[PDB]
Design a protein around this ligand. Structure first.
Ligand code: NAG
Ligand code: CA
Length: 218
């Protein structure tokens, strides 16, 4: 459980840098000119050096059991076709490999590092069932990881059907995700930018809350 409006700045021990394996060219900084709440947010700029250009800040202060994450997110450039990532969660259910939230085929999705599965399937109907991340303004992004396989995702309070799965929940485009039984067991949440293609973008994060209960959009 952890929250931050960044109005007291960037506490670097609360929100350390993460750049697994390699670190070349990405930046994390407090921005005092772009924000959702108040004056400040966290600005992440991916470096132009493929995967190694990645960078994140994050925390291991995550509850066990149900987890709700909420962040206000501003994206500079529209999501393209390439596979990109802006949230990584080390996952015990994948032996430490990452549950990722990002973009592919111009829309938001989940991705498992272990087997490269996506939620939704990136079929035409799957793509239609998820959404783009609008640019140039802070968006309220929230998700819930349950204990029974449930995953729920909201943008500006509206459920994203393609990015929602779980016991008895009818998602017609969840085949890749549910091939094997998968229940997340995350140990951290990291916010930033990563792209194997070397796609560069700038993403700002403000008003982060991680909790055992639904946060909402204020
Ligand atoms: C999909 C969608 O409509 N997202 C909206 C976005 O257009 C707007 O810029 C933002 C403002 O906070 O609220 C959210
Ligand atoms: Ca703020």
């Amino acid at each position: 459980q952890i929250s931050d409006d960044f109005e007291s700045g960037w506490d670097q021990t609360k929100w350390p840098i993460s750049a697994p394996d390699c670190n070349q060219g990405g930046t994390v900084s407090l921005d005092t000119t772009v924000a959702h709440s108040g004056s400040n947010s966290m600005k992440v700029v991916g470096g132009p050096n493929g995967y190694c250009g990645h960078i994140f800040f994050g925390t291991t202060q995550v509850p066990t059991g149900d987890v709700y994450v909420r962040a206000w997110i501003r994206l500079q450039t529209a999501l393209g076709s390439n596979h990109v990532t802006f949230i990584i969660m080390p996952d015990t259910a994948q032996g430490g490999k990452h549950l990722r939230i990002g973009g592919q085929s111009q829309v938001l999705d989940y991705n498992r590092e272990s087997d490269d599965a996506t939620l939704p399937d990136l079929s035409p109907n799957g793509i239609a069932s998820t959404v783009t991340l609008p640019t140039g303004a802070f968006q309220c992004f929230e998700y819930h990881l349950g204990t029974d396989g449930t995953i729920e995702t909201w943008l500006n309070g509206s459920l994203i059907p393609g990015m929602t799965v779980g016991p008895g929940v009818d998602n017609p485009n969840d085949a890749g995700w549910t091939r094997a039984s998968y229940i997340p067991e995350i140990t951290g949440v990291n916010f930033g930018w990563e792209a194997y293609s070397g796609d560069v973008n700038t993403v700002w994060f403000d008003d982060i809350s991680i909790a055992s209960t639904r946060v909402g959009c204020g």
